[PDB]
Amino acid sequence: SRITKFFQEQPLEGYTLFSHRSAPNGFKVAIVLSELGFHYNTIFLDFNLGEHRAPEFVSVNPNARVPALIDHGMDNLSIWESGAILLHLVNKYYKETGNPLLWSDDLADQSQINAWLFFQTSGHAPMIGQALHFRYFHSQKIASAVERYTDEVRRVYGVVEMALAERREALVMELDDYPVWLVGDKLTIADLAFVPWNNVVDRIGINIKIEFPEVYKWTKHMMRRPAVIKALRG
Amino acid sequence: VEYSRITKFFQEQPLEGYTLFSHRSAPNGFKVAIVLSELGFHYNTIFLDFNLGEHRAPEFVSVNPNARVPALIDHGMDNLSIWESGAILLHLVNKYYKETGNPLLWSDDLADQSQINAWLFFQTSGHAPMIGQALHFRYFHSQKIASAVERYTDEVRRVYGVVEMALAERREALVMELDTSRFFDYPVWLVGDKLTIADLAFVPWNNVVDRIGINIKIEFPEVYKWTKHMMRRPAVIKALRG
Numbered sequence: 001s002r003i004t005k006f007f008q009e010q011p012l013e014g015y016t017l018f019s020h021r022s023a024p025n026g027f028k029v030a031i032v033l034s035e036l037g038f039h040y041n042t043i044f045l046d047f048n049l050g051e052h053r054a055p056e057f058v059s060v061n062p063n064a065r066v067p068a069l070i071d072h073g074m075d076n077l078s079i080w081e082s083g084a085i086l087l088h089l090v091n092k093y094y095k096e097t098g099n100p101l102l103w104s105d106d107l108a109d110q111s112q113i114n115a116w117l118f119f120q121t122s123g124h125a126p127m128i129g130q131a132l133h134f135r136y137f138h139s140q141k142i143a144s145a146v147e148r149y150t151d152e153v154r155r156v157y158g159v160v161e162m163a164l165a166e167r168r169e170a171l172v173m174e175l176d177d178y179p180v181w182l183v184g185d186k187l188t189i190a191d192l193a194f195v196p197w198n199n200v201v202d203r204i205g206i207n208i209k210i211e212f213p214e215v216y217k218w219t220k221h222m223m224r225r226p227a228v229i230k231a232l233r234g
Numbered sequence: 235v236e237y238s239r240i241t242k243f244f245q246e247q248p249l250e251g252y253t254l255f256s257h258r259s260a261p262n263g264f265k266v267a268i269v270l271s272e273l274g275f276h277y278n279t280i281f282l283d284f285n286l287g288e289h290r291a292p293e294f295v296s297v298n299p300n301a302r303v304p305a306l307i308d309h310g311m312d313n314l315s316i317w318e319s320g321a322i323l324l325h326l327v328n329k330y331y332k333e334t335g336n337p338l339l340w341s342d343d344l345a346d347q348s349q350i351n352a353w354l355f356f357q358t359s360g361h362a363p364m365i366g367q368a369l370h371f372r373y374f375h376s377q378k379i380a381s382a383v384e385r386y387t388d389e390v391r392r393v394y395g396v397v398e399m400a401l402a403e404r405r406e407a408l409v410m411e412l413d414t415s416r417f418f419d420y421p422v423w424l425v426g427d428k429l430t431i432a433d434l435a436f437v438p439w440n441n442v443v444d445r446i447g448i449n450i451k452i453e454f455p456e457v458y459k460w461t462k463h464m465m466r467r468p469a470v471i472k473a474l475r476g
């Protein structure tokens with residue numbers, strides 16, 4: 001219950017992140033949190049000891065998974081889905097700052113960003129997770145099952161790859177080496193949501209540098225960003 | 235592969251309003267319709283013929299790069315195009331909010347918005363997909379894999395447990411909040427003690443789970459009442475029916 005008295009004298013400001021030393025989705029919030037300049041504690045839970053299943057924590061995230069973020073300033077608000085946490089942070093920053101950093105003050109851009117973000121957490125992350133399970137942890141080796149998800153994951157990358165190619169193509173049509181982004185010709189939580197998972201697809205035989213050119217650049221760019229490194233060391 | 239029809243659509247696009255690209259067996263398609271309907275937004279639905287490869291129409295893969303449904307076009311906003319059911323809902327509730335002043339199925343307070351998304355993502359991230367895999371192995375995979383079918387059926391029963399537990403707490407709340415009992419059948423919601431897109435998002439699928447052998451009414455009491463109130467609403471009925 002190391003989480004108990006952590007709930008009897010909580011901070012007056014700042015944030016407390018609930019992640020795991022390997023949870024890619026946990027890294028999603030770290031990166032965004034660092035990028036926006038928010039100061040935050042980080043509590044790494046141990047799945048094996050079942051800590052993400054203990055009472056005091058599912059009181060924070062009923063689903064009992066990571067990440068989960070306590071917003072101390074907002075009277076210790078609890079947000080749990082990584083996607084929910086990102087939209088909360090960029091919203092929170094735009095409200096305090098007046099500058100849509102990693103976000104957008106335009107409605108059509110927000111929709112396009114939410115689109116790529118929902119697509120990421122629902123069509124990209126889950127499938128990868130599934131691919132990982134059948135290749136490394138499922139109670140039995142079943143190729144058809146692994147192929148299913150690795151294939152789907154390639155379908156997804158093909159989607160983003162073609163998307164980035166059109167953006168590039170659009171840029172290059174500037175005949176009178178630049179980074180490309182999914183929305184608004186600017187980096188947003190739409191792009192950063194993919195990096196944590198992009199760095200792990202090799203464990204399932206997907207070579208981005210060889211298979212997805214525009215994606216390799218897109219992600220080489222994000223990986224070179226301090227915050228992404230400044231919090232990817234586990 | 236005949237999408238000569240879909241191509242015609244993109245040359246003569248309506249002035250303003252909304253067009254929805256869905257399919258008669260797409261729960262997520264109806265999740266959109268249901269909300270598009272609760273907010274009073276008029277719209278025409280195009281049911282893409284996947285068998286004819288209409289979802290591969292170059293014109294359609296520009297609106298929705300992922301060639302999947304739903305997909306909503308906001309003609310009013312210069313034919314803008316949103317493609318994730320979750321992204322479509324948020325578009326609607328925000329659009330509705332700045333155009334009326336009243337956040338129907340939404341919330342005007344930052345906190346409540348975070349809590350609504352939480353459930354919303356949970357529904358699009360952990361609910362729909364697992365139900366899609368359970369359904370896949372139990373019915374369409376290339377071979378029988380009982381362990382794969384059990385794995386996903388369990389996840390669906392586990393996520394349902396989360397919602398059920400969530401709704402149970404909300405009930406206990408209201409109760410010991412005016413009984414200082416009859417109020418054991420007063421409508422309850424996930425956030426703000428009001429119906430929101432957080433709640434509605436689930437109804438389309440909640441009628442799909444019998445196919446994987448889950449009996450909500452017998453196994454999820456709180457969920458059962460929850461879905462039944464939403465099902466009695468005129469706007470919901472019109473949506474699922476059309």
Ligand SMILES: N[C@@H](CCC(=O)N[C@@H](CS)C(=O)NCC(=O)O)C(=O)O
Nearest residue numbers: 023024025065066067081082121359
């Ligand atoms: N839909 C959630 C997924 C949460 C999730 O599955 N998190 C993983 C870590 S990436 C976890 O908690 N795994 C522990 C387990 O499954 O027991 C999100 O995107 O935040």
